[model samples]
Every structure is written in structure tokens, then in C-alpha cells.
Target: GLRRASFLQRGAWRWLREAPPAAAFAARGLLGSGRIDDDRLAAAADEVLDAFPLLRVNFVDDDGLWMRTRENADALVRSDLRGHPDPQARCVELLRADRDRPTDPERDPLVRLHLVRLSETDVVLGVVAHQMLLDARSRYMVLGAVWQAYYGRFRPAQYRDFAEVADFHPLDRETVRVARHRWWSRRLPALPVRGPPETSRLRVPGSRWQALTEPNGSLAMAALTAWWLWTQDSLYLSTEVDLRDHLQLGSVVGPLTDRVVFGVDLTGLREPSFRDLMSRTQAGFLDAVVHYLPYHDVVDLAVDLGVVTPPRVAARWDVAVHLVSIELFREADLIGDTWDGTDTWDGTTTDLSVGELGEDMVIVLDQRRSALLDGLDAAMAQAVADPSAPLPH
Candidate 1:
């Protein structure tokens, strides 16, 4: 029951640790058609919780953060809306209300369910959890399992067992994570916070979508280009990596994504070849994902390395302005302006969440410069024109 938190979970604890308040970081809205028994859904939640003990986690600070098992279970609360004048309205109400609902990491149930009876014909199920416990995709997995559990088909693997299989119970220092920590003892220089971007395009008033005829198997490379072009300096940025494949934690629910720094050392190059640029960025990204560490650990590493002092690193993390981040999603279209900006652990800086929907592109911009999309469009156009040509300065 007492498992040291993953490197990712420790990062998820940053805001909670800093603010020390209840946070409503993650929530999902699911719709059901036809008559539904609230009791059955509640029962399903129970079964799923039994299968995933991490869902019943109460975070503790034992020198460092850890997930400890809760001795008792909390009941799923439901709101009856059977005869409401507007079922859809009530459903939205429940989902929104549940979304803003805070779950304390130090005390509350990490996972919660609220059933809204929309009518005789429809119901909406709202699932809320601390992002420390459930990730973006894992929410759907857990949500789907509720229905599967209701149908007696949910045979879930326990988080307890996953801890053993994943070698996460002890969070040993001899692992690849520590090796990655050693690799990142040195870091790329950060972008100057107050400096203007290399090339700035006119703003579109706010963060609105600009269509791209440009195309991603290689678009990931182009993202590297556009981002680097925007800087025209060494590129040091943060990105999220899904740890499922690396840990082989198949079908387990927990904080599965964490941020890593990727930097392109474009030193002493007035003119850089696009091909080599793409190669370096892709290689840097590949290296970044493999050698991931919690941000705070990196901060401490920096302190140890004499890169910065405690106050210097602490101020940088709180402000988060020296870096820009891009989180890409080729499979899901949920990357645009409407993408859920919840559970933003280090969201204080410039962030571009680019998602591919069919052939269309969408973006959610978290930036001080609203000209981000404009600069990206031009940068992408230039990169696509001649992959081998030196990127025009």
C-alpha cells in the first residue's frame, strides 16, 4: 500500500506542494442512453476501485512524496435529475460542477463518480480524479471499465501488482531513471525570458486557429524547425512523455505522463541546414524521452552541479518563463483551443499543444506572445519548402 511515487507523480505534486490546497485538476463527462440504475454504476465504481488501489491513494510527505492506501472506501454520490425540465442542461451542470470540484491529495478520495439522471432515456456520468492519480487516457480507460464492470467484464490488474511488475514499489536508484539523471547533470542554456523572439508575426487578436495545408510523420520534425526558428537561438524546451511503453505498465492507471527538457545546441551557426536541424531536434527529442526525470529532481541536480542555487531554481520554476513547450498528439484531435488545460503542473510558460485531427491541425496556445500561431505558420512553410536547404535566417 505504501509505494514511493513515480518520477511523474512527483512532478504532478508540484502545484499541490506549492499551493497546499485542494485541487480540481481532472474530470470527464460521459453520456449514457436508455434507463440506467445509479446503484449499478456506483457498484461498478467500487469494483474498479478495488482493482486500482492507487485510486484510493492519500499522498504523504515521508521526506519525499508517496502514495499510501486508504483504509476505508468513499461512496459515489449521485444527483437525481429524472424529471428535470432540461436533461441536457442538468447533465452539463453535473459535469461542470464535478469538474470544478476539488479533491485534496493530502485527504480526499483521489477518484470520484457523480451520476446525473438526465431523464427516463438518458444519463450523464461524471468522473473526477486528482490528476496525480489518473492521466488523460487513463481516465477513459477507467471510465470504460465502469461500464465493463457493470456488464461483469472488467477484469482489471491491480496497481499493487503493477507496482511489483513495474519495480515501482521501492523506486530504486539503480534504475534507468537515475542513469537519465546522470546524463542530464549538464543542461542546455535557457532562452532569455525578456528577449524578443527572432521573428515575430502579427497577432490574430487572440489564440485562434490558423489552417495549415502543411502536413506529421515528419511534422514532428517540422515542429522542431518552427520552434527553433522562432528562437533563432539554442532551443531548450519542455515536453511530456508517456511512460507506458518504457515501463511496460500495460493497462494500469496512474500518472503516466511527465515533462522532460529537449534542447537543440545550435551554437555558432549563422546558417544551419534544415536536414541536420531536423535530425538533431528529433535525436534530442528521442534522447529527452528516454532520459526523463522529475523537474524538481533536475532542479536539485542543478544545485548539486553548481548550475544554480535553491532560490534561483525555485524562482525559475514558479515563473516558468525561460522555456517554451510543445505537446504533440497525432492520434487525437483533442489538441486545439478547446483542449483541456487542466492539471497544468508547469503551465506558467509558453506552451503549444498541437494535435492532428484527420488532416486538419488544431492548437491550444499558452503563450505571452499571441503571435505564436502566426510565427509557426511561416516557420513551417519555410521548413517544408526545402528540407535540405539552410533555413533562411
Candidate 2:
């Protein structure tokens, strides 16, 4: 017998169905040079399925959103024996393809892995998971568990039903509920800054760490500020926030993320300093957090206000901006190191696809790139110490 899907789970199912085609989150890492140990890897996959029962579960529409669980399923790990001249590029292509690949919500596994052998010595391991079941942190948690299982340790996922919390429930106090309704009335209409989707491009610019002087600010904001100055358009922005702490669901597996939107008018600014832009962005972020509401609650509010159309269609944003801090990749890349005595991988790269959420940009502040920049400072210092020493190119 299967249990009823939780509120958050049903919301995820709806988002996956209605969101853009490229909306899935995919992550790839270089495991090392050599033929992959498929037998061990397969066992690890089995271990993951057995340990994390939610990964093997599937969503279906019965009378309502229902979950179908299976304790045993085929191994989630698959290999791409096809060799590519550029393995990393091929991984990206496969990731995009996997993101668009339709899975039977009633039967297909939501989590999967692709091991691509660029050559015998250079292999890349990729994981593509339906956002319905995993966020960035959950994805990495499962990846780390897989590596641990491969190395002969098994750690099961700590699955929690967050709907049990009082905060997740609708406010019973009439005054509190009325106040929340009024708060959203002012905020929801102006949400999700809009932009031209076709105008969006795939860009990987050089590090702007040199100009990042904002105190404890994100590089994504710096990048966004630069773009605002270049275009001078009102920037409508949507950013994702991890709500695990808010819900008191620590280390739970599932989509524990919600979005925050902020609109910035670049033309009205006198002198747009990076510091000033970051300050405004941060303030908007705090505002979004403070006024956060559950997905369906917001939808219902929109319907009550007659802002949304019939059949209960949710509002859509033109462009969303997602920023992944560097520490995430650092933790992911170091997982394989525990298996063997090898030092942690350095060339790991990650990107997000703009699924039906409209045209969006994911700014990954790569720690490896930052390390390379730090290398320049060290090289310059070395050159000063030894006049004959060659400077870093």
C-alpha cells in the first residue's frame, strides 16, 4: 500500500509537470582516470535504493496526488560507454538531453546516474534527478551516500514529513491569516522580474572576483549588477532559497527549496556602486524570506484576489536567477576522495538548465576558479622573492 503524497511533494509534482522542459537539476564530476568499477558502482546504486526508499518511490495521479513505493527496482546507475573527444562537453550534452527525457511518473525512477568514460584514465560521473525529488543539497547528499556505499559504508536518508509542523499549517488566528493575506496582496503582483527570454544567452565570463569588494556578498549579485548597468533595464529577478531550517526539517530528503523575487530599477540610480546594488539585493532577499508562503497557499490567495485565471493556473516568471555558492561543489568533489586515498578532484564543473521556469541564469561561484586566481597572487609573491623566478602566465 502507498501513502498520500505530502503537500510539498504534490507541489513538486505540479512544478515538474508544468515547469519548462530543461528545468531538471543535473550535476557532473570527474571521478578520476581509469575504467570505472561498474560492479561496485552497481552495488552502491542498489545500496542507495535500499537505503533511501524515497528515491525508489514514484508519483501518480489517482483520486489525488498519491505515491507508489517500491522497495526494489532496477539499478539507477547507467553507463555511457560511447567515448567522446571532449568528455566534459559530452557530459553537458547528455545532461541537457536527460533533463528533457520524459519519465513515466507512475513507473520510472526519479533518480539516475550516468558514468561516461572519456577515456580509460578520464571518466566523468553525472547525476540527473527530477527536481520533484531532490534539490541541490539533497542531490549531493545522495551522491555522497553512493560514494560511501561504494566504499563499504551505508548511510540511509533521513526522510521527514514536514507537513506535520505547525508552521506548515494554515494560520488558525483570524487576524494573523488576514494580515498574511494583505501582505501577499501587496507583494505577489510585483513578483518575478520579467525579461526577454530569447535575449538570454549561454555565457561563462571570466571571474569578476577582482571587482568583488562588497562585504560578505554573492558574486551572482555582482554579475547581475554588471548586467543591469549594461542594459539599464528594470531587472526582475527570482532566486531560490533553502527552507530546510525554516521548516525544521534537518537533513531531510526532498525538494526543500522555494523562490524569492526582487525587482531592481537600474536607470533611477545616481551612481550604482557594487556595494549599493548588493545592499538593495540583500534587502529584497530578506523581505522575500520574511513574507514567504507555502506554494498552494500563494496560489489560493492569487485566485481569491482574481489575479489568476480559471482552472487554477499558477503565475509564471520570465527569468529566474539561481546562485550556487562554491562550498556545494567543494563538498561534492571531495566525496570520491573518501573511497580511495586520492586527493580531491579540482576540475569539477556544474550548470543549471532553464526549464519552463522561463529563461534564467545560474551563476556558480566556482571555488576552483577562485583558487586559480589565488595562485596568481602566490606566484607574484614568489616572483618578488626570487628575481629570477618566472611569473605565472
Candidate 3:
């Protein structure tokens, strides 16, 4: 029988790294709308650090459980980050300057936070949150909260004690047996493999990193909804649901220790673009939400829907592509009275607008890691020349 702690801290490292850059894109526009002094931005950074201490958690093993470190913040030196404008480079340099010298193996999952100073008044924050704590939604929530606290509308932060959450003794004896029996009983069938499982390939196909950024299809994301509606109801939409609250989905089984499932669903409601492809995505999203299956309900629902002929042998459907659009304006909670102060992120500082980048391509450009999105004119020409060739086929 496997031990209780065996499945606790494992996580996908790439997801953690990707989280920060995405969150940074969400936050960048706000930093530039008005001039924010370095001191003020630094204070904002501190507010983020203080508010989300769980962010400092590091993995002790591969089970998805994390242990907290004793240190305050993680660091990323200049040598560690690469490829961006001077302002973006300087932002990372600033974090490197303030990072604590010692790492607390017990607490800090030290990560790189890159920055992009957009203008005289704005900053683009970037980071690769170690897989230990950040997930897509968690990253945005943390950023949103920190900005709230920095803007002076939020309250004091709570401390995250890893020990309190990691209760595994009972699972060592009783739960392990139940799980083993359950697992073996259900795995008896060896069904013939169907058509080759579709390997969802992401399309960023240029021979070199530099060529990939040449535009064409460098970072394009089809609206999940738009892609589906245009294609009809043929696609499945899946969303990652934080299952930390469900009871049946656990191993040890007294109660779910943390029902958090780092699940990814590439499906959501279909979105309508100016075109029909967009509408289907919007429909798909609405369809999934209408079903409203919470993680806990999956077991019984599968049987009810005739999804699994034998209830014990469950086969849940996962979506192939998911598209999400979250607005930072609400999370930051800015007050403009009658003024709607939404900001946009593009390479340009003062002139960034919906028209230039277009609403569809915004996600492709707002990244901190590789700067394929830097020079626009060249990137676009490269795409039009060979838009027909698919991603990494």
C-alpha cells in the first residue's frame, strides 16, 4: 500500500512557470495608465508578497503537496532571465536586487519575477511561479488581491501553515487499503484501444524561437467559443475546477485533505467573434455551465448520464481546448466614479488600444518569457506569408 503523503506535493512545473507571465499580462495595463512611482510599485510588490505567503510553498516530492519555506521572497538574477526590451530587463533586475540572499528549503519556492516598465507611469510584472503554488486561477486571484491591498481597499493577509493542512497519518493505515482495493477492482478490464488518442498539439511553428515570433501564428489563440460554434457542437469543452472542497475524490478519505485538483480543461462556452466560429465557443461554454457538475457530483452523474456502463469503472470526458478571458479591472477594484479606466497591454506605451492589437491577439502578446511578440511589423508579415501551415504538425 502506498503511504498517505505519497500523493501530496506533486505538481506540473511548467504550469507554475506559465502562471506568472499570464498574471503579469493581466496586471501590466493597469500599471501604465497613470504614473506609479518606483516606491509605490515596490510597495505594491510588498503587498503582494505579504498577502499571499502560500505562494512561497515548495514541493518536497511529486505528490502535489507543498511545504512552506521560512524565507520572505524568492529571487531571479539578471543572468537568469532573457530576451526583452530594456525596461522589461530592468524590472527583473530590480527584483534581483531586493531578493533575500538565503533560501529556506522549508518555505520559499524562490521564483523569477520579471518586469517590464511600459512607460514613465507603468510597469509590466512577470514571473515563473514554481509549480508548487501557482495555477491559472490562483495566480490571477493572488495578483488581483495584491493590487487591491496596494490600492488600500483590502485587509490584512493570513498565514499559510503547511503542517496544519498536511494531515496524513490515518491514510497510512485505513485509507490506503480502501484505495488499493478500489483501484484493482476497477482496472480489470482491458478494452481494445480505440482510434489513436488525439494528441492536442499547440501551434507555434517556426524553426527557431526567433522565427516563431515572426508573427503569422506565433501566439494566436482561437476563442474557445468561436472555434467551437463555427465548427458546430463537435468539440468538448473542459475547465479546471479546484476540487479541494470535495470529499469523495480523496485518497485517505476521512475528508478530502485538500480537494485541489490541478486539472486543465481545454473546453469552455463557445465565443462569437465577428464570425460564426466564435459563436460555437460561446455556446460550448454556456453548455458546460448549464450542466454544472461539481467535482463531487461527477461519480453519480456519470452513471445517470449513462457515461459509464459500470458505475465503478469511471471514464470522464476531458475537453481538448479551453479559452478564458478574465478582466483585471474588477479584481483591481479601481474607482473612477463615472470614468471606465480599463487599460490595455501592447508593446507601445501611450497608444495601446483595442484597434491596434485587436481583441483576439491580446493574449498572444502579453508574455514575459520569450519575446517573439516584440517587433510587430515583422511578426505579422511572417504569418500572412504562410498562415495556412499549421502549428508544429
Candidate 4:
């Protein structure tokens, strides 16, 4: 028997065929400076595919959309030989290529793993999953599980139905519809309605990645300044809040992000202190969560009202702020002494909409190490300095 795709999953399947490329939403991770047994890695990938039915699903359009599970898992994992001195750059190039190429959901599994060998001991394990299948949390969980499988500490993942956890109120359909319509109607005038720009050539912005304070500081100030500098007016800051935590879902996997837009007035920014701006940013995020709705319902309602298009037109945003903490990855535990206490190790996570959507900028604040932030900041600075250069399209 086949399982029907969720509303949001259906949206992803539809949008995958449209412009802006679903490759943008592809989730990727890398493990470097260690010897990864190819046989073990492939076995781990196989284990993940065997356990999760969704991983084997292929979207077949026979009169209507149906997610049919396939038994083939041979192509899910691959080995790559790289001669490039900079393995990180090579990984980024691979990700860009993956982003530009379309995933054939009808024939292939939604996820692929690549093990890149750089040297005798240096290797990078890269995994890419279509946004429809998993979010950052689920993506990493799968990645970590694969490593666990390789290390002989593998444990089968506990299964849970996301539909039940979403617990969408059927009785509140009208209430939800009205609420969503009002939400969209209020922002219609200010909505930055524009077509996709030519993003064939995208580059990182020129800027300094200053260490931001826990609550706020350089990061907040930098974002505000960049917005003002780019738009010369106000910046629409859409902060993505994971609903799983808010809903007490306890780590069930899916694309469960609710982005609430907060308008930051850039006029007379010279007056307020950076601290004040940070405080306001924090407060704005809090305010957004207070009114958060199951975003899928809102999208459904908006599409029905003829206000905007689904998945594509509905996903437009100006700027986004995401803070990724390295502790979450438990890198120290994963690699043990393999990762030198201080040289330099990192992980890359970016949403599909980062460059695909009509956004001026997206910033991922790394909390793993203060030094890691430096590279990200430099990239941001370059991207900001060269507004014309979009992310590698």
C-alpha cells in the first residue's frame, strides 16, 4: 500500500517541477579529516533507506499524485574521487551542482550520499536530501545515524506519523481560513511582488563575521545595516521558528518551519544602540510566535483566495536569520580525537529557499566556534558587497 503525501509534501512535489529549483531546498552535510569505511558507509545508507518508507517513495503522477515506494537502493550512496586541494570548496561545488540539477522523484529516491576521499586520512561524507523529505533536524539525525551504523553503535529509529503530530484542527478550518486570509491581506500592499531575477552567477558578499553576543549584538546590527544598505527603506525580517518544539512534537521529522515576518524600520537607525536593536529583534521573534499558525493551512487558504500562488509565489521573503549551534551536531563525540581541538572543522546547512526564493539575503549564524563564524561572515560580507552576485544558481 502507498501513503498519500502531506499537504506540504504535495506542495514540494508540485514546486519541484516549477522554476527556482527544489535543489535549493536540498539538505547537505559533510564529515572530514577522518577515514570513513566505504563499505560501512554504504551499509549505513542502506540501513537508513530500509528503515524509512518515505526514503523509498517515488512520486508517480497517474491521473493524480501518488507516492509509490520502490525497492531499488543501489543508487542512494556513491563514492567520489576529488583532486582539488580545498575539499570544502569541492563540497560546496558539488552542492551547487546538486541544487541546479532536478531530482527525479518519479524514478529515484529523494536522498543521495557521497563519500569524497581527499587523502589517506582525510575524507568528507556528504549527504543530500530533497527538502520535501526532511528538515535540518531530521537530516542530521539521519546523518548521525549513518555514522552510528558505521561505528557499530547503530540503533533503529523510532517511527512516528507526522500527520498525527501536526494535529491540524479540522473543525477550525473556517477559523484558520479567515485567519490566513487576513494575515495575507494585511501584507498584500507591502508584499515585495516581483519575478525571479537572473541568478545564474551568484557569489558570497564581502563582510566581516563578527562574533555576536548570546542575546544580540554584531549579528543583529549587521543584518539591520545590510538591510538598510540594500533596500534604503525598511527590511522585512522573516525569522523561521521550528514548530516541533512549540507543538511539543519531540523531534518528529518533516519541513515544520513557520516563518513569521517582522518589519524592521530602517529610518533613523543612527539613534538606537545596537543593544536596543537586538532587544527589538528578540521581541519581534517572540511576538511572531505568539500568533503562529500551522503555516500549511495558511498557504492552503491563501492559494484558495487567489491572493498568491502556492509553494513558489507564496515563499517569497526579503531576509532570514538562522543560528546553527555546533553543539547540536555533537562533533566532538562523533569524531573523538580525529578533530583537533583547534585547527578548523565545520558543517554547512542551508535551506532550498536560500537563493531560490526572492530574497535579498539569508544569514546563518554559527554558534559552534567563534572562528567558524569568521568564514561565514566573510562570505556574507562578499555577498552583501556584491549585491549583483546571487548564490551559485
Candidate whose TM-score is highest? 1
Superposed Cα deviation of residue 141, candidate 4 (Å): 1.7
lDDT score of residue 12 within candidate 4: 47
Q: Of models 1 and 2, which has the larger lDDT?
A: 1
Ranked by TM-score, top first: 1, 2, 4, 3
Q: Residue 371 of model 4: what lDDT?
A: 30
**How would you encode candidate 3's per-residue C-alpha lDDT over 72-114 as one tens digit per residue?**
6643222222244554445434443433233433344444443
Which residue runs does candidate 2 get wrong by more than 4 Å? Answer: 18-30, 34-36, 80-83, 157-178, 189-236, 245-248, 264-268, 308-317, 324-393
For candidate 1, write residues 1-393 as lDDT tens digits.
677877667755654666424453655656677667778878887887777777778889878887788866683777788777877666555655665655566777878876666667566666677777777667777777777788788876433344643335223667766677667764522433322212222322112223122332333433444445456445555555556756666666667655555665565565665566666667666776666666667766766766555344532322221111111212221221135534323323444454343345444454433444555555555556665666545
At residue 66, candidate 2 shows an lDDT of: 72
Instruction: Give the Cα error of residue 96 in candidate 1, in Å.
Output: 4.8
| Index of the highest-lDDT prediction | 1
Candidate 2 lDDT, tens digit per residue, 65-126?
Answer: 87677766663556564555666556556655775676776787777765555555555555
Clashes of each: 0, 7, 52, 14
Which residue window of length 10 is worst by lDDT in model 4? 324-333
In order, the Cα lDDT scores of the candidates are 0.57, 0.51, 0.34, 0.50
Model 4 TM-score?
0.66
Error of 1 at 50 (Å): 2.7
State in Å the error of residue 226, model 4.
6.8
